[PDB]
A paper describes a structure:
A second variant of [name], truncated at Gly411 ([name]ΔC6), containing the core peptide, is catalytically active with methylation of up to seven residues. Isolation and purification of [name]ΔC6 after a short (2 hours) induction in E. coli yielded a less extensively methylated form (predominantly triply methylated). The location of the cofactor relative to the protein is identical in both the [name]ΔC18 and [name]ΔC6 complexes. The substrate peptide sits in the extended active-site tunnel with the amide nitrogen of Ile410 (we define the amide in this location as “i” hereafter) pointing toward the methyl group of SAM; the N(amide)-C(SAM)-S angle is 171°, close to the 180° required for an SN2 attack. The Ψ angle between residues i and i+1 is 0°. Consequently, the amide nitrogen atoms are arranged cis to each other, and the main chain twists 90°. Using structural superposition, we noted that placing (in silico) the larger SAM molecule into the SAH complex places the methyl group approximately 2.5 Å from substrate amide nitrogen. This clash is likely the reason why we have been unable to obtain fully occupied SAM complexes with active proteins. Although close contacts have been observed between SAM and its substrate in a number of structures, [name] appears to have the shortest distance.
Residue numbers in the entry:
A (entry chain B): 7 to 379, 406 to 411
B (entry chain A): 7 to 268, 277 to 380, 404 to 411
Amino acid sequence: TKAGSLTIVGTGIESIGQMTLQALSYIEAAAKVFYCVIDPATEAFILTKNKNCVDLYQYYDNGKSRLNTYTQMSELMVREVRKGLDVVGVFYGHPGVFVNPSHRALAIAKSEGYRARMLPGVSAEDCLFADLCIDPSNPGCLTYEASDFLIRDRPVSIHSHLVLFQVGCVGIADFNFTGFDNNKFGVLVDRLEQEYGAEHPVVHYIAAMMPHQDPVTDKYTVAQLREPEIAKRVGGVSTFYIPPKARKASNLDIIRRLELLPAGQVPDKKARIYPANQWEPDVPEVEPYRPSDQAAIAQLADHAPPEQYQPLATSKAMSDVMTKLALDPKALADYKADHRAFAQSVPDLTPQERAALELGDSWAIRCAMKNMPVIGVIG
Amino acid sequence: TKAGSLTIVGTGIESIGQMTLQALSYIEAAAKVFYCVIDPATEAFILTKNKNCVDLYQYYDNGKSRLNTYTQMSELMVREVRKGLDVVGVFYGHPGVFVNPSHRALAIAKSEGYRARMLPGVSAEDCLFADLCIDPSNPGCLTYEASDFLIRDRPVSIHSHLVLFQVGCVGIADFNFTGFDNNKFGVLVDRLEQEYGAEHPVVHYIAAMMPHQDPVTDKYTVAQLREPEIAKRVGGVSTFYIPPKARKASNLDIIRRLELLPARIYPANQWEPDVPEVEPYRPSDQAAIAQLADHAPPEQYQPLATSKAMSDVMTKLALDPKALADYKADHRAFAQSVPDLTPQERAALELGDSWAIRCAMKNMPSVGVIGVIG
Ligand SMILES: C[S@@+](CC[C@H](N)C(=O)[O-])C[C@H]1O[C@@H](n2cnc3c(N)ncnc32)[C@H](O)[C@@H]1O
Ligand SMILES: C[S@@+](CC[C@H](N)C(=O)[O-])C[C@H]1O[C@@H](n2cnc3c(N)ncnc32)[C@H](O)[C@@H]1O
Ligand SMILES: [Mg+2]
Ligand SMILES: [Mg+2]
């Protein structure tokens, strides 16, 4: 085994609360930490959990290309990996969603034979779905970088959700500590008018960064984005959400191939899943209590568990070790190095529990933890 | 005006580790918990954190429409809200990403006048970006439900990433405890052949659910998906990633209006067909690295300058839901009861404005919110 590793983790968007349990445990275990976050409470919190940190944010500067900064950020991390150290990089949100230097550093580490992994986090788009009360499933979601959207003439879909990141720095390749002069913003507004029309809604979204703050969820017309006092509200942490303009027709040939309806029958056009998208222009709210809904609610009074339902029935020893593998990176490493020896080290496991842990297979652990007489489709 | 609330939270995809600190703290503080997760170690963990939990998974059944189950799930949660209680619903991953009952329950609670909020979590798409080593920024990302993709003829874009959820149950409305007979999967494969070609890559992705497991990241051709032994590997936790065919050329009219020049970023997408190796250390990269020797902190860079007392209270507001509720009820009273704050710190907390808290915690030299790493 070659010494040295790079694990890159996120902190989420809202200070501290949106960090994952595994991001925290890897930060605490690291030999060195490199971080890039944009609120002071999160920075202070990281500095309590590890005493060998470097702030990557100081490698930005007024008038400096962001590409130069990114090469510097990545080289600082890989230099320490090359000394045989367990290094952790930290980026706000999800560390691989609209983040350049993380992909670069991990690809270099991997090419040179070091252990390299990214742990996912909660992005600004994850926050958007939660705060605007939409699901990417209905009716699909397109996500772009705003400048790229324009330069490569990326296609819109007026029947699906559209999300645009980096709307506060259209055509801007450098940095300033105070803020951007977003004077090419009109080029974006022109594209939106062309595709959606002057009166279609655009939602200006800023997720709350502090736990007591409310999110910004302000609706404007495409035309209203040319007013100055409205335009200056769009900054470095602004994202746009553009809702669908219309509903796309169903394909009858596909409906028959999928056997969803027989030949001769057409879908119910006036049918929608509750609730309606609140941001769409002139769309009425759907009824939550149709007769079929009301009948399902009646069945609750009766209801008991089905015969094939598998209730949880585990032990303290088993639950404890499974929790430990998720929260203690050193215990995980030991388990992976030798399943059998780790399994024999754990007190109080039953023969079936010890064997299931010895194997490590998903089927085995489920048999050991559930009363028997992988399907999670909630979509 | 009215007692009772609903907060919906997620657990992430990989057992326990991918839960957020705030999802955990709201689960602990709740009067009643309702959960729907799909591995036993996460279920066991939830049950150690609150004494009053109900498993929503028992409302599925063989040959029963998933729609009927979703209506029952939402009504059970809102019933406890109507009793004036603080209720938490828990769904695996992000609780609003391809999840029907969460949106339903939140919309009903809001319309009736109760407090209602969703806290975001780590989705299967978040895991996909991390494990396949791709960024939705480059070159854009389209995300669809596989059956909806077919039924409403949703457009493909051959120059952007494509992600498809629910590929294991094409055209299937009901539930079965054993698994799906995914016998309409061929209709999906036909659309992908029409749009991308028989030899184009499709990556079959399953994120690790247990902390010791490896992800499934198996690359097939579209044509290979017709083979019975390959098709039957696609199940209830399977997602597809389809990479771009090629790179789209820049538009000169727009380049002129943005005032740019009339150069691929490292690293290249490993999944895209016939993409060459990009050099990590070009001349410009080598010169950026040389500058690290003499580098010092910029003049307008604002180093953190805070106190133990101020850091502690900001951490407390993020990790203690009842402390947050107390502060939001009365900023003055809360700030007065925090020991050892400076006058500037106490006044900043009383205001609660972002500008005030940032001034209190940083040195401002001779005010920005600017995090563009994309
Ligand atoms: C360099 S990127 C980093 C994104 C981050 N890694 C994430 O996971 O969301 C910066 C862009 O993220 C989005 N963003 C960051 N903070 C946000 C917030 N609080 N609310 C809404 N969008 C935000 C904006 O579009 C911004 O221009
Ligand atoms: C009902 S949805 C729930 C999604 C969940 N809320 C999330 O945040 O990802 C079920 C679909 O999620 C995706 N999914 C769930 N678990 C997964 C895993 N471990 N790896 C890849 N995709 C997964 C699959 O597309 C699956 O058919
Ligand atoms: Mg990534
Ligand atoms: Mg949502």
